[PDB]
Amino acid sequence: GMGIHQYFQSLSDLENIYRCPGKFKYQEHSVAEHSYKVTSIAQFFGAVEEDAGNEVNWRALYEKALNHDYSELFIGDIKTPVKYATTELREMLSEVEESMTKNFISREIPATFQPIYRHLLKEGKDSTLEGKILAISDKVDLLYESFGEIQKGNPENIFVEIYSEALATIYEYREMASVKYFLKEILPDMLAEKGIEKTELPQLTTEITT
Amino acid sequence: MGIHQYFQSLSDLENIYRCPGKFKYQEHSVAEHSYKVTSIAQFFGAVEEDAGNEVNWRALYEKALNHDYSELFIGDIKTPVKYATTELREMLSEVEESMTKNFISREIPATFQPIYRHLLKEGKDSTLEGKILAISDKVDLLYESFGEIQKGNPENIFVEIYSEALATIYEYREMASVKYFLKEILPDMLAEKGIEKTELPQLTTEITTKA
Amino acid sequence: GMGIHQYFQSLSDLENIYRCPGKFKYQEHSVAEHSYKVTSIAQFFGAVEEDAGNEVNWRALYEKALNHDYSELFIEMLSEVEESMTKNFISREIPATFQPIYRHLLKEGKDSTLEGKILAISDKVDLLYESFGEIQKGNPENIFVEIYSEALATIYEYREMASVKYFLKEILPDMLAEKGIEKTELPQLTTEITTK
Amino acid sequence: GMGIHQYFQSLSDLENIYRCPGKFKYQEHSVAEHSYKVTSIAQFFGAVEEDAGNEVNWRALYEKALNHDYSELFIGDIKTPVKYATTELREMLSEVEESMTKNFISREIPATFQPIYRHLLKEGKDSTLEGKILAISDKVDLLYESFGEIQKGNPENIFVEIYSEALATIYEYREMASVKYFLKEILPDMLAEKGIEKTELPQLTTEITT
Amino acid sequence: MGIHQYFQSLSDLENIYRCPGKFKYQEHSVAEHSYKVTSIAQFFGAVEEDAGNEVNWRALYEKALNHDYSELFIGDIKTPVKYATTELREMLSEVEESMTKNFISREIPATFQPIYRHLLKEGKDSTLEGKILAISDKVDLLYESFGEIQKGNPENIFVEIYSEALATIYEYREMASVKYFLKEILPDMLAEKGIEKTELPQLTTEITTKA
Amino acid sequence: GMGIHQYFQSLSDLENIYRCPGKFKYQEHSVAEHSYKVTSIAQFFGAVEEDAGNEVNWRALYEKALNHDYSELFIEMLSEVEESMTKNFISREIPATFQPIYRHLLKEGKDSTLEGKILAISDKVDLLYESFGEIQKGNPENIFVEIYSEALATIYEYREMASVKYFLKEILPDMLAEKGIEKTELPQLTTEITTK
Ligand SMILES: [Ca+2]
Ligand SMILES: [Ca+2]
Ligand SMILES: [Ca+2]
Ligand SMILES: [Ca+2]
Ligand SMILES: [Ca+2]
Ligand SMILES: [Ca+2]
Ligand SMILES: [Ca+2]
Ligand SMILES: [Ca+2]
Ligand SMILES: [Ca+2]
Ligand SMILES: [Ca+2]
Ligand SMILES: [Ca+2]
Ligand SMILES: [Ca+2]
Ligand SMILES: [Ca+2]
Ligand SMILES: [Ca+2]
Ligand SMILES: [Ca+2]
Ligand SMILES: [Ca+2]
Ligand SMILES: [Ca+2]
Ligand SMILES: [Ca+2]
Ligand SMILES: [Ca+2]
Ligand SMILES: [Ca+2]
Ligand SMILES: [Ca+2]
Ligand SMILES: [Ca+2]
- A174: enclosing H helix or E strand: none
DSSP-derived secondary structure letter, D18:
B
Radius of gyration for the alpha carbons in chain D, expressed in angstroms and rounded = 18
Q: Which amino acid is located at C174 in the chain?
A: D
- How many C-beta atoms lie closer than 10 Å to residue B209's C-beta? 7
Backbone angles phi and psi of A114, in degrees to 5: -55, -40
Neighbouring chains of F at 3+ CB pairs under 8 Å are B, C, D, E
Distances (CA, A) of F8 to E41, E184, F13, F31: 11, 12, 9, 15
Contact D8, D67 (CB under 8 A): no
- B39: enclosing H helix or E strand: helix B30-50
Alpha-carbon gap, residue F42 to A171, rounded angstroms: 64
Alpha-carbon gap, residue A118 to A102, rounded angstroms: 8
According to DSSP, the residues that pair with F18 across neighbouring strands are F30
Q: What is the largest CA-CA distance in chain F?
A: 57
Q: Where do breaks (C to N over 2.5 Å) occur in chain C, by preceding residue number?
A: 75
User: Left (φ > 0), alpha (ψ -120 to 50) or beta: where does A22 sit?
Assistant: left
Radius of gyration for the alpha carbons in chain C, expressed in angstroms and rounded = 18
Identify the CA nearest to C135 among candidates C123, C147, C145, C146: C145
CA atoms within 13 A on the CB side of C94: 20
Identify the CA nearest to B95 among candidates A21, A95, A161: A95
Alpha-carbon gap, residue D27 to B22, rounded angstroms: 11
According to DSSP, the residues that pair with B17 across neighbouring strands are B29
Provide the domain count of chain B.
1
Q: Which amino acid is located at C31 in the chain?
A: V
Contact F22, C17 (CB under 8 A): yes
Alpha-carbon gap, residue B79 to B81, rounded angstroms: 7
Identify the CA nearest to D64 among candidates D11, D139, D130: D130
Alpha-carbon gap, residue D42 to A101, rounded angstroms: 21
Contact A105, A114 (CB under 8 A): yes
Distances (CA, A) of E193 to A198, B12, E197, F151: 21, 31, 9, 44
Reduce the secondary structure of chain F to three states and give it as a string. CCCHHHHHHHHHHCCCCECCCCCCCCCCCEHHHHHHHHHHHHHHHHHHHHHCCCCCCHHHHHHHHHHCCHHHHCCCHHHHHHHHHHHHHHHHHCCHHHHHHHHHHHCCCCCCCHHHHHHHHHHHHHHHHHHHHHHHCCCCCCHHHHHHHHHHHHHHCCCCCHHHHHHHHHHHHHHHCCCCHHHCCHHHHHHHHCCC
Torsion of CA A145, A150, A153, A158, to 10 degrees: 90
Nearest neighbour of B15 by CB, restricted to A21, A78, A104: A21
According to DSSP, the residues that pair with A30 across neighbouring strands are A18
Alpha-carbon gap, residue D33 to D210, rounded angstroms: 33
- How many C-beta atoms lie closer than 10 Å to residue C100's C-beta? 11
- The verdict on whether residue D138 carries a ligand-binding annotation is yes
Residues of E within 8 A of D103 (CB-CB) are 82-85
- How many C-beta atoms lie closer than 10 Å to residue A145's C-beta? 24
Alpha-carbon gap, residue A200 to A203, rounded angstroms: 6
Residues of B within 8 A of A85 (CB-CB) are 73-74, 95, 99, 102
Alpha-carbon gap, residue E99 to F150, rounded angstroms: 38
Contact F21, C17 (CB under 8 A): yes
Identify the CA nearest to C31 among candidates C43, C44, C16: C16
Reduce the secondary structure of chain C to three states and give it as a string. CCCHHHHHHHHHHCCCCECCCCCCCCCCCEHHHHHHHHHHHHHHHHHHHHHCCCCCCHHHHHHHHHHCCHHHHCCCHHHHHHHHHHHHHHHHHCCHHHHHHHHHHHCCCCCCCHHHHHHHHHHHHHHHHHHHHHHHCCCCCCHHHHHHHHHHHHHHCCCCCHHHHHHHHHHHHHHHCCCCHHHCCHHHHHHHHCCC
Q: Which amino acid is located at C117 in the chain?
A: K
Distances (CA, A) of D61 to A117, D45, D79, D137: 18, 10, 22, 11
Nearest residue in chain F measured CA to CA from C31:
F22
Identify the CA nearest to D22 among candidates F129, E96, E13: E13
Alpha-carbon gap, residue A110 to D75, rounded angstroms: 40
Contact D190, A4 (CB under 8 A): no
Contacts of D57 (CB under 8 A, 6+ apart): D128, D129, D130
Contact F81, F62 (CB under 8 A): no
Identify the CA nearest to B88 among candidates F50, A74, D170: A74
- How many C-beta atoms lie closer than 10 Å to residue B114's C-beta? 12
Distances (CA, A) of A161 to A142, A166, A198: 11, 8, 16
The CA-CA-CA angle for residues D109, D110, D116, to 5°, reads 70
Indicate if the alpha-carbon torsion angle C39, C44, C47, C53 is positive or negative: negative
Alpha-carbon gap, residue D130 to D45, rounded angstroms: 10
Contact D42, D62 (CB under 8 A): yes
Contacts of B165 (CB under 8 A, 6+ apart): B138, B139, B141, B142, B145
Distance A138 CA to ligand 3 centre (A): 9
Radius of gyration for the alpha carbons in chain B, expressed in angstroms and rounded = 18
Contacts of E16 (CB under 8 A, 6+ apart): D21, D22, E29, E30, E71, E72, E75
Contact A166, A190 (CB under 8 A): no
The bound ligand whose nearest atom lies closest to the alpha carbon of D134 is 16
Identify the CA nearest to F128 among candidates F157, F111, F109, F153: F153
Distance D185 CA to ligand 17 centre (A): 5
According to DSSP, the residues that pair with B29 across neighbouring strands are B17
Reduce the secondary structure of chain E to three states and give it as a string. CCHHHHHHHHHHCCCCECCCCCCCCCCCEHHHHHHHHHHHHHHHHHHHHHCCCCCCHHHHHHHHHHCCHHHHCCCCCCCCCCCCCHHHHHHHHHHHHHHHHHHHHHHCCHHHHHHHHHHHCCCCCCCHHHHHHHHHHHHHHHHHHHHHHHCCCCCCHHHHHHHHHHHHHHHCCCCHHHHHHHHHHHHHHHCCCCHHHCCHHHHHHHHHHHC
- The verdict on whether residue A34 carries a ligand-binding annotation is yes
Contact A50, A56 (CB under 8 A): yes
Is A in contact with F (3 or more beta carbon pairs below 8 Å)?
no
Q: Which amino acid is located at D195 in the chain?
A: G
Identify the CA nearest to A139 among candidates A155, A156, A153, A125: A125
SS3 A173: coil
DSSP-derived secondary structure letter, A184:
I
Tell me the DSSP string of D32-96. Answer: HHHHHHHHHHHHHHHHHHHHTT----HHHHHHHHHHTTGGGGTS----S-SSS--HHHHHHHHHH
Resolved by: X-ray
Burial class (CB in 10 A: 0-12, 13-18, 19+), B130: middle
Contact B200, B162 (CB under 8 A): yes
Alpha-carbon gap, residue E32 to E71, rounded angstroms: 13
Identify the CA nearest to B27 among candidates A16, F143, C39: A16
Distance D56 CA to ligand 15 centre (A): 13
User: Left (φ > 0), alpha (ψ -120 to 50) or beta: where does F150 sit?
Assistant: alpha
CA F165 to chain CA centroid, Å, is 18
The bound ligand whose nearest atom lies closest to the alpha carbon of C107 is 10
Contact D137, D65 (CB under 8 A): yes
- B75: enclosing H helix or E strand: none
Backbone angles phi and psi of A18, in degrees to 5: -110, 155
Alpha-carbon gap, residue A14 to F16, rounded angstroms: 30
Alpha-carbon gap, residue D147 to D159, rounded angstroms: 7
Q: What is the largest CA-CA distance in chain D?
A: 57
Torsion of CA D98, D103, D104, D105, to 10 degrees: 90
Domain at F173, CATH number: 1.10.3210.10
Alpha-carbon gap, residue E96 to A84, rounded angstroms: 57
Alpha-carbon gap, residue C10 to C13, rounded angstroms: 5
CA D86 to chain CA centroid, Å, is 20
User: Left (φ > 0), alpha (ψ -120 to 50) or beta: where does C120 sit?
Assistant: alpha
- How many C-beta atoms lie closer than 10 Å to residue F185's C-beta? 14
Contact D130, D65 (CB under 8 A): no
Distance F136 CA to ligand 22 centre (A): 22
Contacts of E36 (CB under 8 A, 6+ apart): E28, E140, E143, F11, F12, F32
Alpha-carbon gap, residue B109 to A57, rounded angstroms: 53
The annotated binding site of E for Ca(2+) is made up of 33, 67-68, 71, 137
- How many C-beta atoms lie closer than 10 Å to residue F101's C-beta? 18
**Measured in Å, how far apart are chain E's first and last C-alpha atoms?**
49
Q: Give me the domain span that covers residue A150.
A: 1-210
Alpha-carbon gap, residue B204 to B190, rounded angstroms: 9
Indicate if the alpha-carbon torsion angle D33, D35, D40, D41 is positive or negative: positive
Identify the CA nearest to B150 among candidates B110, B88, B201: B201
Alpha-carbon gap, residue F82 to E163, rounded angstroms: 38
B/F interface, count of CB pairs below 8 Å: 7
Tell me the DSSP string of B138-204. Answer: HHHHHHHHHHHHHTT-S-THHHHHHHHHHHHHHHTTTSHHHHHIIIIIHHHHHTSTTGGGSSHHHHH
- The verdict on whether residue A72 carries a ligand-binding annotation is yes
